[PDB]
Amino acid sequence: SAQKAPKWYPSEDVAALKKTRKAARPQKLRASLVPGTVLILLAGRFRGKRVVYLKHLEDNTLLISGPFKVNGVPLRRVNARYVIATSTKVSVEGVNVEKFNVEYFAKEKLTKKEKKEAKEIKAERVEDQKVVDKALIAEIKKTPLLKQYLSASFSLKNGDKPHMLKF
Amino acid sequence: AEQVAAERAARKAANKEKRAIILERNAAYQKEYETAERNIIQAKRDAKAAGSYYVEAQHKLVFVVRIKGINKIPPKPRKVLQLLRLTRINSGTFVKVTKATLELLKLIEPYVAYGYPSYSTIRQLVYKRGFGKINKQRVPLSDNAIIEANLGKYGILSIDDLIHEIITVGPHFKQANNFLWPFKLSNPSGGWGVPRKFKHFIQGGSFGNREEFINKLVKSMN
Amino acid sequence: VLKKNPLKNKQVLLRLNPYAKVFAAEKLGSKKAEKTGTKPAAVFTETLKHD
Amino acid sequence: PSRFTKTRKHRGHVSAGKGRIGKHRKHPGGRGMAGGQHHHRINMDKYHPGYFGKVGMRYFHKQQAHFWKPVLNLDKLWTLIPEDKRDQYLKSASKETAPVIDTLAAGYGKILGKGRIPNVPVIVKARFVSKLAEEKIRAAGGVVELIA
Amino acid sequence: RVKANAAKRAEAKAQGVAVQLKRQPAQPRESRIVSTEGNVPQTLAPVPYETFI
Amino acid sequence: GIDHTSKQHKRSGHRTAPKSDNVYLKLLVKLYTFLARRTDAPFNKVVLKALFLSKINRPPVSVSRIARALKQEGAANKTVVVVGTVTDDARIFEFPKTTVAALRFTAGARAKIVKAGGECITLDQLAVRAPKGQNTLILRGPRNSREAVRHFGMGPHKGKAPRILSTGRKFERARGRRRSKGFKV
RNA sequence: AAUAUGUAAGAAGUCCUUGUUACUUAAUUGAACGUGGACAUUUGAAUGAAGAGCUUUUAGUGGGCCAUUUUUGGUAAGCAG
RNA sequence: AAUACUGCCAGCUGGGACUGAGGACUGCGACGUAAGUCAAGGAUGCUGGCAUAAUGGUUAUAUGCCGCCCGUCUUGAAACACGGACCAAGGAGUCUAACGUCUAUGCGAGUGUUUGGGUGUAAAACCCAUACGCGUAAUGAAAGUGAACGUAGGUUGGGGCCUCGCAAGAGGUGCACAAUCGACCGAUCCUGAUGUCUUCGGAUGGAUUUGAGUAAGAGCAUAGCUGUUGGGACCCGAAAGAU
């Protein structure tokens, strides 16, 4: 024998994990995040875009739609830590956001076989974005200049300090 | 027929009555805290109304904290620090004030900062850093079971029984304070409040008697 | 295994201290004292104030 | 063996267990019993008192055959009779049939009297004997005769 | 002290058991009331430096 | 750093295991460690701690010492336990009937006990018949009767034997040992 | 004076009765050692004990030096003690 | 009347940092009429990307900070103290005799076969008698003498065991060991019984004496570490001396 023997053999079975005492309590949001407020996205495809916060999803994410006719952001979910809640708000009393949830934003069923070695918007996604935008635009236009505000993008200028700029 | 409920229900009934007698003990010890405080306030005010001056009773208990390291200590201070179980920096313990213990504090004065602890200081101390010496080990207190196991013969059934015996220095103070391990305190959170520690508290330093500012020092160390 | 601090972690603070629930409910750390109108004596007041 | 010595454990350490200051030399205190009266006087007074001096008178031409006198005590006297006959001789203590012990045959010159032979009559052949050994043999009922 | 302790133990068999056999040190003083009738507190000041020669 | 009141990392100074590689002794340690842990009687603790002992700390116990132990009143029916060896003795001429639990017996000691009606049992036979130590009597041999002990503590005015090869006149009987030549001890 | 230092702060001790002596006493007197009996709220000050006590064996070392205070010789010294 | 200051809250709450150790359950607790749940004896849930040089490692370099050249003698070394240009190999506490302490083993009042003999597969192994060594007796210079008044003594402490005891604890036995008071043995000194080759004997008794003693043996042999001594004696080194 090149190596003789290990006399004490560690057991090949795995012990079960201990019963963890961690419940998934629901997330409490910030006080500045009311459904119907305007947010600045701080990261992603839409960095600095002004978007309208619609619904807090049960994923802990935030269903936003800056209106797609206005700023080009679709009905998408973002994170609470990557947005900044501006003090001004919009009206969401007459909008249907009840059917947007976790499985609505599912990407695709992924296996190991059909993996993309090298590299289409859904017609249902466009139409519910439209009927969200029909309710959202009808109150955006009732106050002056807010449509121009959402179509603009936020940026930090020279000399402004985010620790003293109220958003 | 399997002996599950035959011992679990009896143990749960034993735990319920042990908690009930501790609850009324803590209720009794709580109510004597405000009466022993408010009569002292009323004795000061009654002496002021009578045109007299009320000498308050001298403090039966000091909390003593070792503030200087284990290097360059003369042997007669070094023996007393070991006898008071102050073996390292920010090691605290309770000392019952007698004439024998007063001259001990006068002998290790340039190495310790002692004062008169309040009830809030003591109960926060033993909850956060109270460890019991059981078979020469630092088992943390963490429930009244090991308090009853090692201090049940002196009537101390709980940590609040242990707290009350510390602040009101009774006949079992030697057994209770030796049960408590020396408090491994941290450094103070807001600093020591002085540029230099090793002058007297009268001289703008840290050691010596800080009589009622040991609460400000230890609530920062805790 | 792991030491949990009392005066935070109220379940550990309720494992100890059966009076802590009564203390929290009755607010015995912020109890109002009885109003009284005892006046200090003139001999104490003028000793404190003189020269 | 060599591999369990401390020389192998001292490999790497400079003085090999002998000290930097002391500098292990050939013979720093002398050779043998050197200076037993001058600089090892304290050793030869504490641990070996009696080393220096002529005590006693000289005995020219000592042969240990003249001083051949190994001593057998009375409690070891009954070891001489073998175990095949020892129980038959301890029981039924008879004056007529008494066990003779040729003490000289094993090679003990003198019988001493450390004590408590059983109350049996025993014949003891001796070159020498002590007074208390004879009195205890007389108390047991035995006799001592002398041989040479 | 032995004779006093034996006598105190003999009397503690009748009455006043746990008669404090052990010596206690000089305990810190309990609270007292210091009246001021005839004892109005006279004020004191530090003395000026006088050479006294 | 802490004030080291004593030596940290100090070993207990006692044997936690025998120094021997004796497999049968280690089996008896294994049995009596179980007995010391699982019985509240301190007999199994004493036998285990005596099983650890070395050869100079396990002196021989004569059968005359067994006979003197059984000569005590109320201990005639007791079992005498020697954690160590047992040798016989020609000093006694009547060994009483008893059961003796020893590690080793010499062949003379086995003869002296068996022919007296008694039995020589081992310490595992002891464990079977008496796990808590019912009516037992542990006997220890004379530890300080060893010839190495009379040279211990040698010095002036101690009454101890010096270390010496040849005992006699002209060997340590001169100055320092008598008053005629200088001084006596 | 200060500082430093010795002793004591009990169960190996206290109290009562009566046993030995070739010691002592004028003595059935004491001394020493005793036999019996009574001695928990704390078995006789405080605090600590981190285990206590004992024994063996042997290594290295037996050139020291510095600092506060006291201090000697010296004018003083990173001088000598 | 507020407010400052000091202090308390078993007051609430926000933001940050670091840590996630254990791996079925037990335990303490809280909320709920119970059922169960839980921030309650240590982190889980969801999601995304990549699946390879991405992360990590090695190595080189750069940068920030640190970092004196090692060995030795020394109170003190980076020393303007000494050795060292570099590399490879060799190179320094070994063996024996006699032992000491400790440990292991075998036998144990005995132990040790190996001087020798027989035998052998042949320097092995196996077996064996007589002595002898050391021990079981010491003490004295020697002639010599030579260790139980007792349950091998008494006292104190003493593990363990036995009896009583719901349990502390109390008695009895108390091994080892420690201290002490005795007793016995040898030596020294003193008194001197029957006796008698009338100058031998030494019984009995005793001591501010003494011993490396006894007082129900503990040793022998082997092996090992350490230590000692002798030898070259850890290595190296003289000036010399003699034939």
UniProtKB/Swiss-Prot annotation, chain A:
GO terms for molecular function: RNA binding; structural constituent of ribosome. Present with 37100 molecules/cell in log phase SD medium. There are 2 genes for eL6 in yeast. InterPro entries: 60S_ribosomal_eL6, Rib_uL2_dom2, Ribosomal_eL6_CS, Ribosomal_eL6_KOW, Translation_prot_SH3-like_sf. N-terminally acetylated by acetyltransferase NatA. It is found in: Cytoplasm. The modification Phosphoserine is found at S11. The modification N-acetylserine is found at S1. Coiled coil: none annotated. Component of the ribosome, a large ribonucleoprotein complex responsible for the synthesis of proteins in the cell. The small ribosomal subunit (SSU) binds messenger RNAs (mRNAs) and translates the encoded message by selecting cognate aminoacyl-transfer RNA (tRNA) molecules. The large subunit (LSU) contains the ribosomal catalytic site termed the peptidyl transferase center (PTC), which catalyzes the formation of peptide bonds, thereby polymerizing the amino acids delivered by tRNAs into a polypeptide chain. It comes from Saccharomyces cerevisiae (strain ATCC 204508 / S288c). One of its GO terms (biological process) is ribosomal large subunit assembly. Keywords: Acetylation, Cytoplasm, Isopeptide bond, Phosphoprotein, Ribonucleoprotein, Ribosomal protein, Ubl conjugation. Belongs to the eukaryotic ribosomal protein eL6 family. This is Large ribosomal subunit protein eL6A. Gene3D superfamilies: 2.30.30.30. The keyword Zinc does not apply. One of its GO terms (cellular component) is cytosol. It comes from the Eukaryota.
From Swiss-Prot, chain B:
GO terms for biological process: cytoplasmic translation; maturation of LSU-rRNA; maturation of LSU-rRNA from tricistronic rRNA transcript (SSU-rRNA, 5.8S rRNA, LSU-rRNA); ribosomal large subunit biogenesis. GO terms for molecular function: RNA binding; structural constituent of ribosome. Keywords: Cytoplasm, Ribonucleoprotein, Ribosomal protein. It is found in: Cytoplasm. It comes from the Eukaryota. PROSITE patterns: RIBOSOMAL_L30. Its main location: cytoplasm. GO terms for cellular component: cytoplasm; cytosol; cytosolic large ribosomal subunit. The keyword Ribonucleoprotein applies. Component of the large ribosomal subunit (LSU). Mature yeast ribosomes consist of a small (40S) and a large (60S) subunit. The 40S small subunit contains 1 molecule of ribosomal RNA (18S rRNA) and 33 different proteins (encoded by 57 genes). The large 60S subunit contains 3 rRNA molecules (25S, 5.8S and 5S rRNA) and 46 different proteins (encoded by 81 genes). This is Large ribosomal subunit protein uL30A. It comes from Saccharomyces cerevisiae (strain ATCC 204508 / S288c) (Baker's yeast).
UniProtKB/Swiss-Prot annotation, chain D:
One of its GO terms (cellular component) is cytosolic large ribosomal subunit. It comes from the Eukaryota. Pfam families: Ribosomal_L27A (PF00828). Residues 1-38 are annotated as: Disordered. Disulfide bonds: none annotated. A motif (Nuclear localization signal) lies at residues 6-12, 23-29. GO terms for molecular function: RNA binding; structural constituent of ribosome. The keyword Cytoplasm applies. Component of the ribosome, a large ribonucleoprotein complex responsible for the synthesis of proteins in the cell. The small ribosomal subunit (SSU) binds messenger RNAs (mRNAs) and translates the encoded message by selecting cognate aminoacyl-transfer RNA (tRNA) molecules. The large subunit (LSU) contains the ribosomal catalytic site termed the peptidyl transferase center (PTC), which catalyzes the formation of peptide bonds, thereby polymerizing the amino acids delivered by tRNAs into a polypeptide chain. PANTHER family: 60S RIBOSOMAL PROTEIN L27A (PTHR11721), LARGE RIBOSOMAL SUBUNIT PROTEIN UL15 (PTHR11721:SF3). This is Large ribosomal subunit protein uL15. It comes from Saccharomyces cerevisiae (strain ATCC 204508 / S288c) (Baker's yeast).
UniProtKB/Swiss-Prot annotation, chain F:
Keywords: Cytoplasm, Isopeptide bond, Methylation, Ribonucleoprotein, Ribosomal protein, Ubl conjugation. There is a cross-link at K115 (Glycyl lysine isopeptide (Lys-Gly) (interchain with G-Cter in ubiquitin)). GO terms for molecular function: RNA binding; structural constituent of ribosome. The keyword Chaperone does not apply. Pfam families: Ribosomal_L18. It comes from the Eukaryota. GO terms for cellular component: cytosol; cytosolic large ribosomal subunit. It is found in: Cytoplasm. Component of the ribosome, a large ribonucleoprotein complex responsible for the synthesis of proteins in the cell. The small ribosomal subunit (SSU) binds messenger RNAs (mRNAs) and translates the encoded message by selecting cognate aminoacyl-transfer RNA (tRNA) molecules. The large subunit (LSU) contains the ribosomal catalytic site termed the peptidyl transferase center (PTC), which catalyzes the formation of peptide bonds, thereby polymerizing the amino acids delivered by tRNAs into a polypeptide chain. This is Large ribosomal subunit protein eL18A. It comes from Saccharomyces cerevisiae (strain ATCC 204508 / S288c). The gene is RPL18A.
